[PDB]
Design a protein around this ligand. Sequence first.
Ligand SMILES: *O[C@H]1[C@@H](O)[C@H](n2cnc3c(=O)[nH]c(N)nc32)O[C@@H]1COP(=O)(O)OP(=O)(O)OP(=O)(O)O
Ligand SMILES: C[S@@+](CC[C@H](N)C(=O)[O-])C[C@H]1O[C@@H](n2cnc3c(N)ncnc32)[C@H](O)[C@@H]1O
Ligand SMILES: [Zn+2]
Ligand SMILES: [Zn+2]
Lengths: 284, 704
Amino acid sequence: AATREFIEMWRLLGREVPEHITEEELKTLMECVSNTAKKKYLKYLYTKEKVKKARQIKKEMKAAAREEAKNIKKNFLFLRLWDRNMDIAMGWKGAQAMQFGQPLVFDMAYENYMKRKELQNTVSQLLESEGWNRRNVDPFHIYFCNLKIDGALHRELVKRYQEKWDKLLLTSTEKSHVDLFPKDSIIYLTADSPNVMTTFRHDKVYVIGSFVDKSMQPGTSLAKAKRLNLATECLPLDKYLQWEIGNKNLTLDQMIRILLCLKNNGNWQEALQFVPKRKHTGFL
Amino acid sequence: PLRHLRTREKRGPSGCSGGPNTVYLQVVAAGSRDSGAALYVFSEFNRYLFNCGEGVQRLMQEHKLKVARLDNIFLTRMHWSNVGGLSGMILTLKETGLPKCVLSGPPQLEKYLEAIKIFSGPLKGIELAVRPHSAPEYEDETMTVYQIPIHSERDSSLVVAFICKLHLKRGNFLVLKAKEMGLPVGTAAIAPIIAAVKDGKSITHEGREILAEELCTPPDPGAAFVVVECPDESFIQPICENATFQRYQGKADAPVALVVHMAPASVLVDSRYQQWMERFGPDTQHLVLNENCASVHNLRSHKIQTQLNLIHPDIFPLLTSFPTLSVPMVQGECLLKYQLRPRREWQRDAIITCNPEEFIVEALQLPNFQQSVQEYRRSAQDGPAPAEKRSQYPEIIFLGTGSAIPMKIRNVSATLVNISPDTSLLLDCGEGTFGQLCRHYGDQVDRVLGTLAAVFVSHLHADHHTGLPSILLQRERALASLGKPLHPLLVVAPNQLKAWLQQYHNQCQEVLHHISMIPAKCLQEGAEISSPAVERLISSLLRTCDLEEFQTCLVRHCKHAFGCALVHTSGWKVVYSGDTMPCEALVRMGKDATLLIHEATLEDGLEEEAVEKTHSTTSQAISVGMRMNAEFIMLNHFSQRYAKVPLFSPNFSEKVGVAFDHMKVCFGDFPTMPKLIPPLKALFAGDIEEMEERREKRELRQVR
RNA sequence: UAAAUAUAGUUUAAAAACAUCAGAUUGUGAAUCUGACAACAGAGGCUUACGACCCCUUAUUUACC
Ligand SMILES: *O[C@H]1[C@@H](O)[C@H](n2cnc3c(=O)[nH]c(N)nc32)O[C@@H]1COP(=O)(O)OP(=O)(O)OP(=O)(O)O
Ligand SMILES: C[S@@+](CC[C@H](N)C(=O)[O-])C[C@H]1O[C@@H](n2cnc3c(N)ncnc32)[C@H](O)[C@@H]1O
Ligand SMILES: [Zn+2]
Ligand SMILES: [Zn+2]
């Protein structure tokens, strides 16, 4: 193809192009309509290899050091099988969560407003968001709504979870949140909501849009929450925090962590700790 | 600090790069009567402005033309149409933190800078270096400027023409070809000799002599463009026979890409001028800026007026816009672009369009606008008529309600009072005041200027008297058209205003022959009887304006700040207060006034900011009117924070209202004013819901 | 409107550290092993390249006499 040599010459120009690239990555570069998009995408691949090789050089160093130390070189109550034990313990809590835990909904209706770069990141935060829920004392009953089976988000989640996807203790479905819970008990959280949330109510269902807008798209969730007559709310960031830098749209992992602390009787002092410190110059 | 200075210092002596990648020529002012003529040059490393006229800064601020990056401002003539409005331009640069700005043009610029220091104060913080045409050629990272002084057959006969020349840009370097030839590429094996092949220098490699130009694309020789102004007929002959111009037109190795023509229609049709224009060659494009260009510059002002016109057509009148030649030319248009590098072409994509139909539709689709307007229309149009049918005069036209600097919606303070159909006076004259007058009346501007009886200046702040000269020259032109004899205008202003005009008169251009200034000190109550010459001028003011009394006082503002109070033989009294805090002297003078025009710069809760800034808040201004017992209160001189509408305090009664640009108010409209608020809130619902969030944020931030 | 800023797990400084996901029946350095994900707001440009340089959008914080 004409694109293959297109890259090789860029290698002669030293356009920060990686050494080895799979054909799968080549067609992704094909989709790039602009040279700057190709320039940006290639740099991402280049740093991808740089971290891996630096990772590997520092990795074989670990093996070499450990084996050398070994060459130079009772009564127990429990066997060292802790990692397995915690996984089972979290599973039991997770099973209880889906029978009695408060429903937390992740809305997956934003797939049309996401590029591939942001769609990948959304799954990364979704993995972390669910990870923190599992380790929590009182996990939420996480709901994955509007998750099309053939959609990109569903396919990406399967690859990152592999066989664990079918064993996760969460409800994943194609039906909208309005079809699962009463419309009067649903609060669509969003930074653009004119209403400021003061108290975490345990009888309400909170909807978090699984949307990562690196290219800012204000009001996307508000329009969704206004097309259907659903209440909206926003965190009291300005009320308590001296915001100075950055955007007020927090990450999904931070969002669920903030809600998790609030649901555990924590006050705004503890709950808002998870907001990045670089964004605010103190608390009050 | 600023970003651009760091980038410049990073490049060092313009190293690591040649000329700018792209350089285009954009028109900011098409040359209309209201907006004047101006030209804007864009480049990767530098930006230049030509003929900074009155209101030019407003246009650049409105059309996303960044001001914090300008380097030089070129003036083709020392005439208020070209240097006027420059004072406000300098302040804008100072606010942005620009360290130095270079001015080029006639050698009268240095005297003008010290002339503006009388009222503008010290220009500390920004270095003003005047570069007269006698100075050597100016060299930049982008282009060289040749200043040509032209003298017609201080100095009023001097016109400066600029012959710019873009520097040669190094061509692209073909990496693929060099490697095949046997030139290693990569690491230090390419870094040293890549510059040599890029700079056009022959390089020797392993005994092989390689010409740099061979392995690189043909470098751009550097397009040249000319900016020339021909004010009148007396300037054609010197321009045609100028020796310097001949070096760029008849020659074949020094082509001219473009030639800006800031000349009237009569000059262009001249036979001598036509031959000179053709002498540049058929390959030279010609751009003309004059009054023939019909275009809309203040698009936002037109848009908002059309939306407001729906509420009340009379109170919100719609704005009205004011030959085959051998050599073809392109008529100037706002935002019209002419690229000079890398392609020579006319870029017409950025030209704005003024179609009202979109504006009306946009207003109607708003949530509660149409319903509110319809509700008000039936309650007023079909409602009971007032028992007292007041006369159609006096009518107050609020040409400007700005505080410090003009913006898209609000211009600096300026109010026109029409005492009768054949007489009027201006209560204030800020920068661009004439432009508002021309826009508000169009073809009727000359008639209105002919009825101008007197002009009042509250104080020496630049936002109150910087537009007076523009009125004088335009009034002189307007009077000549009607054939009326030319007589000096009556100006009421502080004594120190003479120094700024006297300095300008003796160094820049004769303007005092249009002025018969009455000091504001002798017009106060119980004031000492001045010289008989001043006394007869006072008698003229009352007679010409048909005013029973013209009072004045000292308001709580900067030193030598005065208010106003108009009394008419009929009985109605109009009281105007410039920038002032709540003052007791104003209350005594304006007692039982018919209409009150009071400053409302700041909102509620900004009381502390008002005393330091020496102004009044919305509630403070309203309370003054009630203390004065005025039949109605008009608020103007709003801060630029409330660009569209000020915050509506709960104290707003039926005797108060806000002011808008190009807004006509008559004594018979007072009962209607309270009913116009609900439609205004719907129209400005978005701006209304954004202003109080800052107030909510303000309280928390100060509390913190 | 203008000027500085913007790290999508979080910080540091101009690439790392601590975290995240999958697999592990671990003899108590699992304090590990084999994988997954590594985009310093976004988009479009310039250049042999540069995180440089240059426009445009959104967002944040200040100022708007
Ligand atoms: O462009 C701004 C600006 O001119 C003015 N404005 C609004 N808030 C402020 C402020 O706090 N301080 C200053 N100096 N100027 C302010 O109003 C305009 C607001 O821009 P918008 O795009 O939001 O308004 P609109 O919906 O009418 O569209 P547009 O045509 O002006 O872009
Ligand atoms: C990072 S935000 C991005 C989407 C954003 N709401 C928009 O419309 O562009 C992703 C999700 O986190 C939640 N969220 C982010 N910041 C929030 C805040 N400050 N208050 C409440 N919810 C927030 C929102 O519900 C949103 O669906
Ligand atoms: Zn003022
Ligand atoms: Zn003032």
